[PDB]
Coordinates of C-alpha atoms in Angstrom, one line a residue:
Chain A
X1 CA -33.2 7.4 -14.3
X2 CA -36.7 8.6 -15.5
X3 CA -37.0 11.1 -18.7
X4 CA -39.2 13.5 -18.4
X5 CA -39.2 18.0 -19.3
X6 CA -35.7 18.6 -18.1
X7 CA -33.7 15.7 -19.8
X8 CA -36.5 16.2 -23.3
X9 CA -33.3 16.9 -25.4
X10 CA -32.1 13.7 -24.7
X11 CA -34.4 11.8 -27.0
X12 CA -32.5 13.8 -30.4
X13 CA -29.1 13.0 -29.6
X14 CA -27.0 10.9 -31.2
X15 CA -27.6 7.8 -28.8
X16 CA -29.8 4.7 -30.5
X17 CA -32.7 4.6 -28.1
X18 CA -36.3 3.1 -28.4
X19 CA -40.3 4.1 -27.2
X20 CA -41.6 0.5 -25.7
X21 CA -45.3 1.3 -25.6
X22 CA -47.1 -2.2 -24.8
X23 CA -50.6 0.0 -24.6
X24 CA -52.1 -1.7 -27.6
X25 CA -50.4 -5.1 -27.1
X26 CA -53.1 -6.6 -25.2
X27 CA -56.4 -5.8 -26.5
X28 CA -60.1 -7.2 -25.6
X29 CA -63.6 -6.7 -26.5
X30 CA -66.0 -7.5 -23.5
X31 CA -69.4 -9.2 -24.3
X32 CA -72.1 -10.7 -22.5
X33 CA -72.5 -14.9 -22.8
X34 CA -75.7 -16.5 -23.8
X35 CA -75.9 -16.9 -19.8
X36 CA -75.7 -13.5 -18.8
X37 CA -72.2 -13.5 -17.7
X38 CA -69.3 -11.4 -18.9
X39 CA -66.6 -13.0 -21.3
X40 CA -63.6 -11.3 -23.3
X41 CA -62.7 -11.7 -27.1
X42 CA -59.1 -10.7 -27.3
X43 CA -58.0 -8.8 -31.0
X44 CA -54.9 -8.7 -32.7
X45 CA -52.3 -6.1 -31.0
X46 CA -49.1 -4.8 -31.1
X47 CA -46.1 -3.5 -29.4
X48 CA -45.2 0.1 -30.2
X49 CA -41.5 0.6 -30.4
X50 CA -40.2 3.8 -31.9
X51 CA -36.5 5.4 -32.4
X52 CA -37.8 9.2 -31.9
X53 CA -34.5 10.5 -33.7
X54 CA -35.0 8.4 -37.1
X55 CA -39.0 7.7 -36.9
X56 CA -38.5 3.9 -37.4
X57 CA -41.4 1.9 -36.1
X58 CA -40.7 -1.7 -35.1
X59 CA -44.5 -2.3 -35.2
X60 CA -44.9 -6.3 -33.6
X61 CA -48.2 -7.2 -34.3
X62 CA -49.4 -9.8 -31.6
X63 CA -51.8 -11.8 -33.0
X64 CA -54.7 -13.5 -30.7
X65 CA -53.1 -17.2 -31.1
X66 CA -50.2 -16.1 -28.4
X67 CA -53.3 -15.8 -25.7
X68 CA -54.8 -19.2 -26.2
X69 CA -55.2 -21.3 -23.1
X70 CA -52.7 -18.7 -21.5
X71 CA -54.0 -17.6 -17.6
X72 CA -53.3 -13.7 -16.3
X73 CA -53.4 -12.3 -20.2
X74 CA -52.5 -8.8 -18.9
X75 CA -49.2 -10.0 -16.9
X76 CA -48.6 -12.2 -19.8
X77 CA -49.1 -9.5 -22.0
X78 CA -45.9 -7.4 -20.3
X79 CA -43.7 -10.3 -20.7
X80 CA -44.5 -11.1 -24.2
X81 CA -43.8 -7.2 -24.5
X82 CA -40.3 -7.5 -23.1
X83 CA -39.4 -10.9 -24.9
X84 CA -40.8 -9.3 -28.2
X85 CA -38.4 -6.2 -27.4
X86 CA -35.7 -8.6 -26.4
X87 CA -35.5 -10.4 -29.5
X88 CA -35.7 -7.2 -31.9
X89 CA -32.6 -6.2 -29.9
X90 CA -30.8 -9.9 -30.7
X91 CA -32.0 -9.3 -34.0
X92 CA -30.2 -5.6 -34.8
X93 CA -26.4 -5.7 -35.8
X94 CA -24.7 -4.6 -32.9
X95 CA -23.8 -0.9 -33.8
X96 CA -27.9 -0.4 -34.2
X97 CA -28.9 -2.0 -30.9
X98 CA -30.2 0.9 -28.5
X99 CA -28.1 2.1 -25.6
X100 CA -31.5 3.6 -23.9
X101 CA -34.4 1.5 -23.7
X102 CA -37.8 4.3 -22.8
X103 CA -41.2 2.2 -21.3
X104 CA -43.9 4.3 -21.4
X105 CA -45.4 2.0 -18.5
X106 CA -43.9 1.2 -15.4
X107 CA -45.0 -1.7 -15.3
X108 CA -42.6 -2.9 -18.1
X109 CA -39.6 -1.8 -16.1
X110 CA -39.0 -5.3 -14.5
X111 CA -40.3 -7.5 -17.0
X112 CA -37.7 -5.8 -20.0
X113 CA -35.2 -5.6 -17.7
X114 CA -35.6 -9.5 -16.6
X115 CA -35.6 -10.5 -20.7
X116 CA -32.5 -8.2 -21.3
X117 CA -30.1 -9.4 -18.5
X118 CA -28.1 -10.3 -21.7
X119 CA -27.6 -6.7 -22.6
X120 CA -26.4 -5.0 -18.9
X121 CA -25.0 -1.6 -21.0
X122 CA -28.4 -0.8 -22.2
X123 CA -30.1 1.6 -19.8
X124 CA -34.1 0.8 -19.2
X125 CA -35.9 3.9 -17.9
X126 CA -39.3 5.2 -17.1
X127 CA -40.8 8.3 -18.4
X128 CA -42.5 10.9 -16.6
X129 CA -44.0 12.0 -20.2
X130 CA -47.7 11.2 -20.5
X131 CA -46.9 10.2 -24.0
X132 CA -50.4 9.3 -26.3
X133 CA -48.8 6.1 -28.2
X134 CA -51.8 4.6 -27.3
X135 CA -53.4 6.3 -29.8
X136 CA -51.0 4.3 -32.7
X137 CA -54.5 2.2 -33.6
X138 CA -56.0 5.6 -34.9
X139 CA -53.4 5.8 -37.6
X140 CA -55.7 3.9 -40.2
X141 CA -52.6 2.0 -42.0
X142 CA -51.3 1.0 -38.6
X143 CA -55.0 -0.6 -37.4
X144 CA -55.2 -2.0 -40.8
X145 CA -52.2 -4.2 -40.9
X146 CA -52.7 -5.4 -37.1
X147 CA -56.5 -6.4 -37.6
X148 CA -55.6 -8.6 -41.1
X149 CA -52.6 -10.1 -39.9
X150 CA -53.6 -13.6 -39.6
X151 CA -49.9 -14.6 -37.8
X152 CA -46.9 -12.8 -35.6
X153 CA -45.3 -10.2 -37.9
X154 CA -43.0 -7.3 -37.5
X155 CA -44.0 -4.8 -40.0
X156 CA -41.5 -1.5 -40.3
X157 CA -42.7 2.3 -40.7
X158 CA -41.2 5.8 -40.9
X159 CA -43.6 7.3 -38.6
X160 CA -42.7 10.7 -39.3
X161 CA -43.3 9.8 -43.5
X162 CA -40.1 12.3 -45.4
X163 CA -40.7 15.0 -42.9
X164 CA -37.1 15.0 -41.3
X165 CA -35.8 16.4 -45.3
X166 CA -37.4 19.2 -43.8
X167 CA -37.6 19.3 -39.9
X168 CA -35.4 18.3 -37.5
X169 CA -36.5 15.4 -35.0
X170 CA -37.4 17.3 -32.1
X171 CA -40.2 19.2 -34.1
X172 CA -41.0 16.0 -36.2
X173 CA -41.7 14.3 -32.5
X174 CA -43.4 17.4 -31.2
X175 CA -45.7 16.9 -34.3
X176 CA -46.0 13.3 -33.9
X177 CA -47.3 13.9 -30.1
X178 CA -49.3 16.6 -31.2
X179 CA -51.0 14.2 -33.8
X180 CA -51.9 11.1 -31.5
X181 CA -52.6 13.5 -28.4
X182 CA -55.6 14.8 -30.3
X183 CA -56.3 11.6 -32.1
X184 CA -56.9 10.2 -28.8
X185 CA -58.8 13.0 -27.1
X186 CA -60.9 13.4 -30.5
X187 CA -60.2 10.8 -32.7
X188 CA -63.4 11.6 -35.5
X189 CA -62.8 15.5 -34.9
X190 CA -59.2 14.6 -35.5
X191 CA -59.3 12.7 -38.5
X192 CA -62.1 15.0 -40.0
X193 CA -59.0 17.9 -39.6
X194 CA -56.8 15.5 -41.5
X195 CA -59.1 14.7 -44.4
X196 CA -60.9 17.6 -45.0
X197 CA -59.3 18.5 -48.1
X198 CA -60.0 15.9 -50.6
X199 CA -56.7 17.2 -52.5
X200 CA -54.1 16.5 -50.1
X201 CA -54.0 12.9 -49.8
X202 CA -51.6 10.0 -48.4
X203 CA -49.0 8.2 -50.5
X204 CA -49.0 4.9 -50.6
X205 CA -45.6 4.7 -48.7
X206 CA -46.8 7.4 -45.6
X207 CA -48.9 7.2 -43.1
X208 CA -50.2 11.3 -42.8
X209 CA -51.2 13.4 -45.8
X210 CA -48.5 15.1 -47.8
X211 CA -48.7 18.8 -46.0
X212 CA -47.5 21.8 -47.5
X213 CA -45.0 23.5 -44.5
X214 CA -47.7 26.2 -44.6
X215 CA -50.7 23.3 -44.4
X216 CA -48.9 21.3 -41.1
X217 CA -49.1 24.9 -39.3
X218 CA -53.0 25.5 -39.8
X219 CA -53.3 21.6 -39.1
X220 CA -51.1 21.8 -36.1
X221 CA -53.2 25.1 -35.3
X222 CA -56.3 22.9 -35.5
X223 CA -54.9 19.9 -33.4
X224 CA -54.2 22.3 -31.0
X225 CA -58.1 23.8 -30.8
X226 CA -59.4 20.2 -30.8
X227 CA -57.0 19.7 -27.8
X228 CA -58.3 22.8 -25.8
X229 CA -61.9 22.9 -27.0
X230 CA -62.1 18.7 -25.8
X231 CA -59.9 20.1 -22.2
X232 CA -62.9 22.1 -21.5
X233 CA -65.9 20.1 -22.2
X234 CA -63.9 17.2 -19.3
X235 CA -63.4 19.8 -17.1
X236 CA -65.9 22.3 -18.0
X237 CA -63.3 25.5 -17.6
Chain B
X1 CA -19.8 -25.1 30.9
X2 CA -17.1 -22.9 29.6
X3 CA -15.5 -19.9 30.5
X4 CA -14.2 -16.5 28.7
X5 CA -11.8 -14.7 31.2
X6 CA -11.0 -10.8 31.0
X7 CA -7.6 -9.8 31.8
X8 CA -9.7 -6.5 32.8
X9 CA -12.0 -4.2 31.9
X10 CA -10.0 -0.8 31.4
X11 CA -12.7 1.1 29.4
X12 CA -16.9 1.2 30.6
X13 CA -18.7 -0.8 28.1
X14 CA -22.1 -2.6 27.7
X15 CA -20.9 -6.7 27.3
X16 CA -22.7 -8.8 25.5
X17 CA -23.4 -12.3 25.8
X18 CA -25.9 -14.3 23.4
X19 CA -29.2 -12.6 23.9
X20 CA -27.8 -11.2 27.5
X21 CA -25.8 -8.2 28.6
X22 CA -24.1 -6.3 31.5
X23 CA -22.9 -2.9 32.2
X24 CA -19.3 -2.6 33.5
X25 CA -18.1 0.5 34.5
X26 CA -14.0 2.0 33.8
X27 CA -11.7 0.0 35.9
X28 CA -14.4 -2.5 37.4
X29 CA -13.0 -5.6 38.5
X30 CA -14.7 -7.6 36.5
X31 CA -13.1 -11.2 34.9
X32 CA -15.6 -12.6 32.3
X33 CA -18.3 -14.8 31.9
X34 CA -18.5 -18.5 32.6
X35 CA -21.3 -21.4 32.6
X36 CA -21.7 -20.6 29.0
X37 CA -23.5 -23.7 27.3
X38 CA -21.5 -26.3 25.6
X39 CA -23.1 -27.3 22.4
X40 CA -23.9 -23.9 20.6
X41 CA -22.2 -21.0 18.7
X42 CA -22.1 -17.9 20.6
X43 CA -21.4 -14.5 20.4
X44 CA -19.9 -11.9 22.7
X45 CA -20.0 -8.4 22.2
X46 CA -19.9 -5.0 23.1
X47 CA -20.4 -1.0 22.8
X48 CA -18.1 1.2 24.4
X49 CA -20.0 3.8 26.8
X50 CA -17.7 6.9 25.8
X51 CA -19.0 5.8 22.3
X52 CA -22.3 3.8 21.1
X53 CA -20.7 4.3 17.9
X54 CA -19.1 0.7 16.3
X55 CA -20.8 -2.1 18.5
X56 CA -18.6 -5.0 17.8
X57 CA -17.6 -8.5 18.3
X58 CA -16.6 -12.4 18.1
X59 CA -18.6 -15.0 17.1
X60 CA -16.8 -18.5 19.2
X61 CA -17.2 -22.3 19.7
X62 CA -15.9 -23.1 23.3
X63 CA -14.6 -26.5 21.8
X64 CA -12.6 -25.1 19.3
X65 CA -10.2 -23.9 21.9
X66 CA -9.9 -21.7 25.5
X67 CA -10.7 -17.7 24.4
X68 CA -10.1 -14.6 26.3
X69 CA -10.9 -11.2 25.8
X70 CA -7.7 -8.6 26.5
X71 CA -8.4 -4.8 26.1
X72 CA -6.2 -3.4 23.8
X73 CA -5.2 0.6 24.3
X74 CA -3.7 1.0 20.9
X75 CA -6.5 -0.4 18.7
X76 CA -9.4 0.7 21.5
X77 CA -11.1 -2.3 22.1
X78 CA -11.8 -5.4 23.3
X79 CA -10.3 -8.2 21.5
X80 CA -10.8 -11.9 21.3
X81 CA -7.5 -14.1 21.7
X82 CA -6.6 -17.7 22.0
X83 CA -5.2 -19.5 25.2
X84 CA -3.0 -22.1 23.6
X85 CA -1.5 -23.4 26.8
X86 CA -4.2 -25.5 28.5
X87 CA -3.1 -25.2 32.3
X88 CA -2.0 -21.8 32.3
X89 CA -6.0 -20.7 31.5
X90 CA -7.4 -23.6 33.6
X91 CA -5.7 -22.1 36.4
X92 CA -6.6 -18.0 35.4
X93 CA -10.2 -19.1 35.4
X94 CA -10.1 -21.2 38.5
X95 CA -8.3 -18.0 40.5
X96 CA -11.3 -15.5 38.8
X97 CA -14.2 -18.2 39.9
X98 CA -12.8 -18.3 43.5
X99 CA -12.9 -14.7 43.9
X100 CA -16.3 -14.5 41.9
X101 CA -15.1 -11.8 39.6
X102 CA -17.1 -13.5 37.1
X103 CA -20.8 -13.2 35.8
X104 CA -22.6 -16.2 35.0
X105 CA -24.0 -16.9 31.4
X106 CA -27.7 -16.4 32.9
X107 CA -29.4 -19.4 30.8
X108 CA -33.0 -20.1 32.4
X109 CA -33.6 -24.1 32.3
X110 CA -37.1 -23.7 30.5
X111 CA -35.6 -20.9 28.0
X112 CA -34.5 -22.7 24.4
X113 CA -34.2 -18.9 23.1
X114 CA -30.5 -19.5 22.2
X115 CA -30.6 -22.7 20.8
X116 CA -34.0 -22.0 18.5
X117 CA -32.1 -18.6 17.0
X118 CA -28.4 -20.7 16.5
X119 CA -30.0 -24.1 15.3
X120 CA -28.0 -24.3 12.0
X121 CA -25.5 -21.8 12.5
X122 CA -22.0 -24.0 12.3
X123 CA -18.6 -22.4 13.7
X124 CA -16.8 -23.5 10.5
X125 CA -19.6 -22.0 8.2
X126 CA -19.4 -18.8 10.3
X127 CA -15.2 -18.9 9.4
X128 CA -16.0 -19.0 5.3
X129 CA -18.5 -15.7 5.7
X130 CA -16.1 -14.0 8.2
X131 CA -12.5 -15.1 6.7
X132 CA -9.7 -14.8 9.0
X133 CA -8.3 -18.0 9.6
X134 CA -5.5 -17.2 11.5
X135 CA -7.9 -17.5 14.7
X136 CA -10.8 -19.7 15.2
X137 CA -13.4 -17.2 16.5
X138 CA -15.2 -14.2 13.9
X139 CA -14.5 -10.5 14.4
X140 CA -18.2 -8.8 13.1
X141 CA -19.1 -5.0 14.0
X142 CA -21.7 -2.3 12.7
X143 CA -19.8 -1.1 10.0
X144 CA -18.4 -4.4 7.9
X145 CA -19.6 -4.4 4.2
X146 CA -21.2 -7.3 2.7
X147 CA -19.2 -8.7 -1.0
X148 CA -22.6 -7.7 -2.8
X149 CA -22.8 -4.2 -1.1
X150 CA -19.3 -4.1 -2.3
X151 CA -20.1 -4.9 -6.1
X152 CA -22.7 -2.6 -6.3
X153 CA -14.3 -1.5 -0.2
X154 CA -11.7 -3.6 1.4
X155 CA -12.1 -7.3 0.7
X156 CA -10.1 -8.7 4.0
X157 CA -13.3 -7.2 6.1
X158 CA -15.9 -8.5 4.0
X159 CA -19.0 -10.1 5.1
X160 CA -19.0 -13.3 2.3
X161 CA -22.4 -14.1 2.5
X162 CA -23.9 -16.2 -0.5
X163 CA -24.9 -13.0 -3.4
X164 CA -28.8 -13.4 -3.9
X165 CA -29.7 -10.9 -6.5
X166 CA -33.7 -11.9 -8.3
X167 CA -32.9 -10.1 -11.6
X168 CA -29.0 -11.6 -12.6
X169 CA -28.4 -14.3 -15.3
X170 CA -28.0 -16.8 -11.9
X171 CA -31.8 -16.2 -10.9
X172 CA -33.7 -16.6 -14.3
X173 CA -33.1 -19.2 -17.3
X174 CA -32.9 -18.3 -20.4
X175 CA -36.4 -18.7 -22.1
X176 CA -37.9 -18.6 -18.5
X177 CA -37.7 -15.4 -17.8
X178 CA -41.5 -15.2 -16.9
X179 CA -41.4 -18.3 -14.9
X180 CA -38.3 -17.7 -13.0
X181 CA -38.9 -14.1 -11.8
X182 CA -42.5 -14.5 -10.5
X183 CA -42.0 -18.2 -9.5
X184 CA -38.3 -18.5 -7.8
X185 CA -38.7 -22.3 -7.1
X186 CA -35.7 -23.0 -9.9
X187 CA -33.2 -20.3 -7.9
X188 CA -34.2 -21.7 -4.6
X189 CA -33.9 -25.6 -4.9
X190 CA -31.7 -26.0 -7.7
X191 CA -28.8 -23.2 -7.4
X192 CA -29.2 -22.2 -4.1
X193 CA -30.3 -25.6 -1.6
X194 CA -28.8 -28.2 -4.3
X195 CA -26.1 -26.1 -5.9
X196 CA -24.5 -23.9 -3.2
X197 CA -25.6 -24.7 0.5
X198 CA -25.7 -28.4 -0.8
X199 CA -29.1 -29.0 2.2
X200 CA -31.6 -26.7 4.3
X201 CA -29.3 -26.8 7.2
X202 CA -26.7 -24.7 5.3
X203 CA -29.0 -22.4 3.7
X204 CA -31.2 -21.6 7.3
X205 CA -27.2 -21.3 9.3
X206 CA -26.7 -18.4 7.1
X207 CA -30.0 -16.9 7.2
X208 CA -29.9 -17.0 11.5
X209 CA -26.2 -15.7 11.2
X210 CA -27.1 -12.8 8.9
X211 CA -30.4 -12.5 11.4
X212 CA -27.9 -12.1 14.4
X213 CA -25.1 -9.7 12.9
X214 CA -28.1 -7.3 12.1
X215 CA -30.0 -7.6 15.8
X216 CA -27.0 -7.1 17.6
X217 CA -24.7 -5.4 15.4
X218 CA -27.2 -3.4 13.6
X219 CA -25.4 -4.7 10.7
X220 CA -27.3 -3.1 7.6
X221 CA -25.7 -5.4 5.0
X222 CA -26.3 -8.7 7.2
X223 CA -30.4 -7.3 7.7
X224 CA -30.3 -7.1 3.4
X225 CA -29.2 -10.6 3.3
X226 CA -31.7 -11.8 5.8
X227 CA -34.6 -10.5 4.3
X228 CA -33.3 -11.4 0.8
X229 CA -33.2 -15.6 2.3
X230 CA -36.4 -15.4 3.2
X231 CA -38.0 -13.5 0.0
X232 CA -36.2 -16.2 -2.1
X233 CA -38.4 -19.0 0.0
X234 CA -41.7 -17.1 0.5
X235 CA -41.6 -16.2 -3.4
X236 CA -41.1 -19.8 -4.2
X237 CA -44.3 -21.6 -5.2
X238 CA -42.7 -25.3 -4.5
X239 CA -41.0 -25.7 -1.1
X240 CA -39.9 -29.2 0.8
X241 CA -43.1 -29.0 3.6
X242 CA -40.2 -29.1 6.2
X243 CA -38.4 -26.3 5.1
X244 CA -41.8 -24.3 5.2
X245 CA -42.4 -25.6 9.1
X246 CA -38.8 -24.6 9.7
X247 CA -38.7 -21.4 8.3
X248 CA -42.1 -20.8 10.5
X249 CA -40.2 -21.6 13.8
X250 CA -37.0 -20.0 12.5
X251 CA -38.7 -16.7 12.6
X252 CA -41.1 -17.0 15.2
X253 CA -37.8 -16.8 17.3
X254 CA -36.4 -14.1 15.3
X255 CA -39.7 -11.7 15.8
X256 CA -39.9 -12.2 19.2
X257 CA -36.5 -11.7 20.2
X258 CA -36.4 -8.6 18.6
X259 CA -36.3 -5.2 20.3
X260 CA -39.4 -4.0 20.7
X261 CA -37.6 -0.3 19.6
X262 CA -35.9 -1.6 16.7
X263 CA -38.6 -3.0 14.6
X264 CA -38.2 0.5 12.1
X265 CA -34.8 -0.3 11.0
X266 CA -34.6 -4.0 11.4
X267 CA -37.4 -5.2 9.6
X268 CA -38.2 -3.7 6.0
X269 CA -42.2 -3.1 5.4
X270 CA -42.0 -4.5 1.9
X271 CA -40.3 -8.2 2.6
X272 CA -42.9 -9.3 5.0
X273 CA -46.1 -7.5 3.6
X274 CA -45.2 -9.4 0.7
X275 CA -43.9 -13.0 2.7
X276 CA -47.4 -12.6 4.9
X277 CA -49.6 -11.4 2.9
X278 CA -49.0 -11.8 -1.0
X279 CA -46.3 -14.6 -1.7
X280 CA -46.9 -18.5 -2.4
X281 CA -46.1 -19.0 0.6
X282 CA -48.6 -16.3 2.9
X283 CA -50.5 -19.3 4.8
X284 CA -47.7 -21.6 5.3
X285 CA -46.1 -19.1 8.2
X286 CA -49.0 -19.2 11.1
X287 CA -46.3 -18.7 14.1
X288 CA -44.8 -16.2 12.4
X289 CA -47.4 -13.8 11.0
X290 CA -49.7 -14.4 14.6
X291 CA -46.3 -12.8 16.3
X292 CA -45.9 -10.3 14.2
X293 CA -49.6 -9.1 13.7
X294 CA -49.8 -9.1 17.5
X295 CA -46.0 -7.5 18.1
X296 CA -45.8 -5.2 14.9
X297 CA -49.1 -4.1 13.3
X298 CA -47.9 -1.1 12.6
X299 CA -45.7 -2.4 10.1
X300 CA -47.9 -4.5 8.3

């Protein structure tokens, strides 16, 4: 059944699982027409599918060509999520296909289940985890490669960079949350934390800056202000 | 008209006949039922008074041979049995009819309720679902498992009906996935109506017979599959235009021969919010949703 604070664990076990977040999959601007009337130009997206033990990001970018002269984009949009997902399955030798499939949306349930009726041993499961991977497009070389790609691609990542040589998963995860929690709450605030320090920069081959251990904990420290600070301008407490 | 004799009634029990029934109390001379309607299926049934638990009984085809019903003390309860020697049951029935000791199948000349709910429900169809074939009448009660309940114990008192299951590799093509699960046209008319019940008749004889096993069985397994036939039409966008006015009268018939009381656990909240209100099909079913808006708003 559903994951959520007593089954955490889970996620850092030796089982292949997956993340499905179709968040950023279908994605729209809304204008106003010469007319007056309201009209949507759809961007590039993706579908965010992440191994939480190993960091490897199957980033499907889902380019604005799969919406032409399609009807009911956002339904659509599930389905081409689940086929997508589907087909990176087929794709993986069988000893690297998941056994645990996670959608961070209900709504996905059905529509991945439908598209994997081919795979009956791989569990597909809700999350009561208010996970931010809808916050992925705030990582600058993750928008960067969706808004240039001019076809469908699957580009892979590490999204954890080389920090399990020094971490284990569940802390490289709880980092990784507490990153795109704030870059979604805060996203300049956030990426003015990351930056400030014109010295630490970002190889080439990462996505974050290369953090001293005793930099990630006054950067964590500061995600973690941002967080609260932001919690009590909503709320006002 | 046709005749099932008692040999007695040793236990009290509510009988059932069709849509009718009858108390008879321990030891009552009472002899069975006759002036029941050639031409339909029908069922006969019964709860014991000492205990409601288990209703049970046999679905029958008076030209398929000359029943009976026989209490048996061992098993505890009534049971069905053939008559294979023509004048010795001409002549028990003719002795019970003299003497009046039997009630008569209480059909009102203007009332079609019986035939409208059995229309395509077929004896040898009936015999396939419930498979005994050593007789030629259908033991059903409360309790019997459907073979999809059973996937998901003992085969010999199975209810067979035809597994209907929207997310299996039978229900959506590869490559329509999409298509197949929010349009069900493909399961309906090609696997189910051309492939498996081979015509409408076939496919609405099952849907009536699972109806019936749940009204008057409270059969939970037989109420799954009814609901589950008429999801797989109402979420079909493309439907013969007869099957749609059938289906309408269908269960116009079913709804209002309902119990009143028994609406909660015989009708599920979801099904028909969604066959009403929501599916391709939500204004093609004017008898039905009238009767139900008016009988079970609550409900919906």
């Amino acid at each position: 059944g559903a994951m959520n604070s007593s089954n955490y664990a889970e996620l850092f076990n030796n089982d292949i699982k997956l993340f499905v977040d179709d968040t950023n999959v279908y994605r729209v601007t809304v204008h106003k027409t010469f007319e007056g009337n309201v009209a949507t130009k759809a961007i590039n997206g993706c579908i965010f599918t992440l191994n939480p033990k190993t960091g490897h990001l199957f980033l499907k970018i889902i380019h604005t060509s799969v919406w032409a002269g399609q009807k009911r984009l956002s339904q659509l949009a599930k389905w081409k999520t689940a086929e997508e997902v589907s087909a990176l399955v087929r794709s993986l030798p069988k000893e690297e296909q998941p056994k645990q499939i996670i959608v961070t949306r209900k709504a996905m349930l059905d529509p991945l289940e439908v598209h994997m009726l081919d795979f009956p041993n791989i569990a597909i499961r809700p999350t009561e985890l208010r996970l931010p991977f809808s916050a992925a497009m705030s990582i600058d070389k993750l928008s960067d490669v969706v808004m240039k790609a001019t076809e469908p691609q699957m580009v892979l990542f590490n999204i954890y960079d080389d920090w399990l040589d020094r971490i284990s998963s569940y802390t490289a995860f709880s980092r990784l949350t507490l990153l795109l929690r704030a870059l979604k709450t805060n996203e300049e605030s956030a990426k003015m934390i990351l930056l400030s320090d014109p010295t630490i920069t970002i190889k080439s081959y990462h996505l974050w800056p290369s953090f001293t251990d005793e930099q990630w904990i006054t950067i964590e420290s500061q995600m973690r202000d941002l967080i609260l600070t932001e919690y009590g301008r909503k709320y006002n407490v | 008209m046709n005749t099932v004799p008692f040999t007695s009634a040793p236990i009290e029990v509510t009988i059932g006949i069709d849509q009718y029934s009858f108390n008879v109390k321990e030891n009552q001379p009472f002899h069975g039922i006759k002036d029941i309607p050639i031409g339909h299926v029908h069922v006969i049934h019964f709860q014991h008074a000492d205990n409601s638990s288990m209703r049970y009984g046999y679905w029958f085809d008076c030209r398929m041979g000359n029943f009976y019903i026989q209490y048996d003390p061992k098993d505890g309860l009534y049971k069905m049995m053939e008559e294979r020697d023509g004048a010795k049951f001409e002549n028990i029935v003719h002795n019970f009819k003299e003497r009046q000791m039997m009630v008569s199948y209480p059909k009102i000349d203007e009332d079609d309720t019986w035939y409208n709910l059995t229309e395509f429900v077929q004896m040898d169809k009936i015999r396939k679902i419930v498979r005994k074939d050593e007789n030629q009448f259908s033991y059903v009660d409360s309790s019997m498992t459907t073979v999809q309940e059973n996937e998901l114990s003992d085969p010999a008192h199975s209810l067979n009906y035809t597994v209907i299951n929207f997310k299996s590799r039978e229900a959506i093509r590869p490559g329509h996935e999409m298509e197949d699960f929010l349009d069900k046209s493909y399961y309906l008319n090609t696997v189910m109506l051309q492939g498996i019940f081979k015509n409408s008749s076939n496919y609405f004889g099952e849907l009536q017979f699972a109806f019936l096993n749940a009204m008057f069985f409270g059969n939970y397994g037989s109420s799954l599959q009814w609901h589950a036939m008429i999801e797989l039409i109402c979420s079909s966008a493309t439907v013969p235009k007869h099957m749609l006015d059938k289906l309408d009268e269908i269960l116009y018939y079913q709804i209002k021969t309902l119990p009143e009381q028994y609406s909660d656990i015989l009708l599920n909240e979801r099904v028909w919010n969604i066959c009403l209100y929501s599916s391709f099909q939500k204004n093609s079913l004017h008898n039905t949703e009238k009767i139900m808006e008016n009988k079970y708003p609550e409900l919906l």
